[PDB]
Symmetry: C3
Subunit: 59 residues, 3 copies
């Protein structure tokens, strides 16, 4: 009786814990990828500048 | 009966919880590798376009 | 009771687990993001340099 009840309480709580961990870690991930996306957006705009600048250098 | 029962149940907890810590770290590390491919591919492209442009 | 004690042990163990997995996943994500940031810093620097010498050449000419 008691062994089965504890082990099932373990199973259900553990399974909720696994979800919460991944949920929270994957949200941190999304947070860091956003920061590197912003950075890549800004790079790409700088490259677009150099492109026009290069074509203008010809002459 | 009951210290035997407490002990058995805690041993169950220990192996189940640790496997789950490992499980959660594996899936999150996988999701992160997924988001890293897309970021690194974007940067690969940018350096390629700068090199071409040069 | 034995059940109450077993379940309390389970709650502390699981809570410590959640904290540990999140910490370790996040440390991973931090190392992978730091590597890219490094790559990205080098290119930022090259671009600023190429932009200023082309923006200089334009002005001169």
């Amino acid at each position: 009786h008691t062994l089965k009840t504890a082990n099932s309480y373990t199973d259900v709580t553990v399974s909720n814990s696994t979800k919460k961990a991944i949920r929270e870690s994957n949200q941190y991930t999304d947070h860091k990828m956003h920061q590197l996306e912003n950075r890549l957006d800004k790079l790409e705009k700088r490259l677009l500048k150099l492109l026009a600048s290069s074509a203008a250098l010809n002459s």
